């Protein structure tokens, strides 16, 4: 796992960086606004997935997680169990192939 | 005793042979405690055995050869339902003189005993031989004597023995015989329990007791034909016989004596663990309240539990020291508590309460261990031996852990009375060399070396057999050969190198200074886990970092307290602002997780704000408080925040990089950050997240001894520390330690005014936009972007505006609470209205300090 | 008794807990299989930890090997005890005196270091570091 965990406004352009993106780690980038570069939908851009969060915490508005529950060892154990369980389900169903899973919302947003 | 046991179990080939035989085949004959098959009991090893007669002969053969050499042995034999008879007469002497007990008197006593047996028992008809033995105490102590009477040949039941024993208690002849011998109470000479308790095997003894020495043995031959004819003759040449085998009541294969047919768990833990034995020896040193009072008892049981998982029986035993508190709590609470402190704390308490017994016990332990090594290897000492005895001797003062560089590092626990730096007490200090462990090995260890020197000399003085004297002479010789080596530099260095393994305590470095609730101060260690305490005694808390300020409890009447409070009130006269600033700065001593807040505290100069910041920095010290360059903000230095608790800055109109501040307020960030200046900064951003965590405040009062001297004053620093910790405690009690919950209307208004004056978007939102529950007009991200465009063009400057970037800025701005997703997947404005040129607020549309009579620092009971 | 002797005996005695392989730095490195009942950091159970120096081996040679020395001690002492021919008894006495002369050396620091260095070759398990942590499952 490699997290690009923050940003300011629109992200910078990344054509040479995406040429490098085309390695044994999962990648994710966590901006609030759109990146300054993109490519052909069957060229180097074929690997980009996009998704935008909808719900807001304050059905898109909802009411210790950040400072208390994050550091609890039992919470981390439970999340590890969740991760291994989902890995088991993906392995049993899709044989470990991530493209076979249907994600119309992510595909549409991308 | 164990030392003599050691000595006696080497130079005495027979002792070693017997132990080897017992260990190699007699272990398969072991019996679980309480088994009736037990016949031989080892009062030392605590192990009971069941031997067949064939191997019993060889065992008795081993018991005879060992006995003749004077070895001290503590065996026992189990006599049960059908065995021989034994009589004990613990004579109580009127005077210190030992009665003679000539052979004629003993023969008369044997005659009387057989008379009582004949009257009070049924014996087989025919010719039988009954053997009598008289073992006498070697010396009469304080007018107290005794002797034993053994009848292995006879075989009767326990009821018969009890009847006989009761009968002898009424024998006038024996009573009158003992009368002239100086017996105070002849009637109490006999033990009625003589038929019940298992008896010592011949040659054995009790701990710290000399064995009963055989005086003489009589032979009696009885026949049924002439019951009134009682011949008695001394047995001739007894010393040539297997005395242990003959005198064994249970043995049936004696050469002379013939068969005439007529809780443990605690002991096992103690015997299988020398360390548990040592703890038991030192646990009796504690005062009575450490098992009846719940806090102390809980601390003790916790220390035992953390020490190891098998100390339960000691925890039971120590809890069982009081009958009523073993039942009013105790027997159930022990299970609860069993399901941070270790033996070092108990060890220190034992020193504190019983110092002299503490010293005697520890010195005896050192002597025993060191002599065990000496006895084990003929007086030749190597590095690991002395390393172990030093670790047992001063294992409560040093800890060694491998640092990041892969080199072992020695830490010292500083105690009062040693040379040191200022502010270095009751902590741990890094040492390149264990210098005190080099001096200690040469000086204090020499005392333990001496003690064994006089030990060996004394054993030389005692009258022993020639081989023992020769062997002691050789052992002493090798010992002084090995004695001077503790002064050799190479030997000492090797001993330190070997001891680096014993003193190793893993994870000391990564558990060092991790607690944010503990602080290192000049007079000790400060504690803020609970409100209100200073640790100025022995403790297990791993504190290395420290600051030179001494800590004292809050004394309001102190002149420095009043002076600093007056300066504080003069600098910030506003009650709300002063209280908020003090509660915010009270977190500077706290080195844990923060609330991600930063302040831009402006001022007109010579207002005392720089004085206040300097005071905080000096009080916290360079270890906890650091100066941060402002040049990072306008642009290695990030690492300066490590472990700190306070950060600060100290030209005209600097430009602040939003990325630097975003990265700063994000190892973890555990420092309180403040920015000080005389010129207002320029902030080139509009994101609400960055701005909401920022504050702006301006010092106003101008002043027209503090600046250069009173800051250097140690008393002023101590008083300010008391002030600061008192605000921290007050903030924790009142608002659960939260700085956002403190109301500071002046500071909040100043921050809003600065933000509006610097950011155009915020002032636009607060002026040209008014929230309206009625007016829910769809101010779509696009439309409102345009309206801002004309707003900026017609109010500030003519510039080209882009819809996308302005919409993105508005997304993360303060309006985000009012933007909701339309069904068309487009951002729209809901429940709000825009004011156009010359437009005023409509109805229902809203824009988007009790001075105490008492002292302001005093407890205000107005939540 | 010399270094390689005790090195082989120790390898037989604890060959199931330590692995030595030289890294790219050209220095031999000790690995230890952590078992329950020992001091350790959190989560370091049933896993191999990099040790700068084999503290466990250094202590082990002093304590547990001493048991075997002791057993040989009473073994030869028992042969002394039994009635044998005079030359045999003299041989056993000489072997004894030698035994005790060589017995204390296991506590010596330099001897312990030499034994460790000699055992570094016996405990060597090629390709260990390269195959370390390679399985993604």
Numbering used by the authors:
A (entry chain M): 688 to 709, 728 to 763, 771 to 775, 779 to 825
B (entry chain G): 10 to 271, 287 to 363, 372 to 564, 566 to 668, 678 to 692, 695 to 710, 726 to 763, 779 to 922, ...
C (entry chain M): 413 to 549
Tell me, in the authors' exact words, what the paper reports.
To gain more insights into the assembly of C962R, the apo protein was subjected to 300 kV cryo-EM analysis. Three-dimensional (3D) reconstruction and refinement further confirmed that C962R assembles into dodecamer, which is consistent with the size-exclusion chromatographic profile, AUC and SEC-MALS analysis. C962R dodecamer is formed by two ring-shaped hexamers. The diameter of the outer ring is about 140 Å; and, the height of the C962R dodecamer is approximately 290 Å. The C962R structure was refined up to an overall resolution of 3.67 Å. Although it cannot be predicted by the sequence, the structure revealed a compact domain for the C-terminal Asp833-His910 region. The domain is of α/β fold in nature and was termed Tail domain hereafter. Dodecamerization of C962R is mediated by the AEP domains, mainly through the hydrophobic interactions between the side chains of His120 and Tyr238 residues. In the apo structure, the six Tail domains are symmetrically arranged along the central axis; the diameter of the inner ring is approximately 50 Å. In the absence of DNA, C962R exists as a dodecamer with the AEP domains located at the interface of the two hexamers.
